Amino acid sequence: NSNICEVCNKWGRLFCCDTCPRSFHEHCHIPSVEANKNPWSCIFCRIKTIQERCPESQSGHQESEVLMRQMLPEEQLKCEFLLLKVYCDSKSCFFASEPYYNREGSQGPQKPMWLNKVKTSLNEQMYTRVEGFVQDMRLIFHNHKEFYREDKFTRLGIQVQDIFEKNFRNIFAIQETS
Ligand SMILES: [Zn+2]
Ligand SMILES: [Zn+2]
Ligand SMILES: [Zn+2]
Numbered sequence: 001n002s003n004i005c006e007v008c009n010k011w012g013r014l015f016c017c018d019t020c021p022r023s024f025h026e027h028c029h030i031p032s033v034e035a036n037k038n039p040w041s042c043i044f045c046r047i048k049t050i051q052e053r054c055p056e057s058q059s060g061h062q063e064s065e066v067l068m069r070q071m072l073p074e075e076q077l078k079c080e081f082l083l084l085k086v087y088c089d090s091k092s093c094f095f096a097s098e099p100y101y102n103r104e105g106s107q108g109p110q111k112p113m114w115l116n117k118v119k120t121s122l123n124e125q126m127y128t129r130v131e132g133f134v135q136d137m138r139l140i141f142h143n144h145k146e147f148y149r150e151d152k153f154t155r156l157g158i159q160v161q162d163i164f165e166k167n168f169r170n171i172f173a174i175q176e177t178s
Helices: 043-053 063-067 073-087 090-096 115-123 130-148 154-171
Strands: 014-016 023-025
Touching: 043 073, 063 130, 073 090, 073 115, 073 130, 073 154, 090 115, 090 130, 090 154, 115 130, 130 154
Parallel strands: none
Antiparallel strands: 014 023
């Protein structure tokens, strides 16, 4: 198994996947690594199993259909993975914790949002449809773009949004387009 956490790339108290060589800190894995279960399979392995069980699940989909899906266990898992994929990028640190807004010439957003809040919401089963999760994720980056205006710091929002959107298209098998 790897000797660093797959998400944060640090050593420490790691839990090892039994079906692949990845390792995780307890709260880096999403959901948080489970108390018992021997063997244990990580979220990457659980997602791979869904695909393998239903190969046709990788045929192209319309985003509009994906967003209206109810958050049954498999969609719940997919959103947890997609959230985890954003945490995997080091630039997610900027969007992880609760932000504050005091910049000359800008006003803060009406509805602040951040990754740890989305993480809690997923954990507490507060989203009934994929759309709920996706809207909060996109709001993160949209609030950032709006607040930072022409400061070059706006690019961090573009960059992390691009990681989100690419992973969304991959995980939910969105029909490729030009
Ligand atoms: Zn970690
Ligand atoms: Zn694994
Ligand atoms: Zn099938």
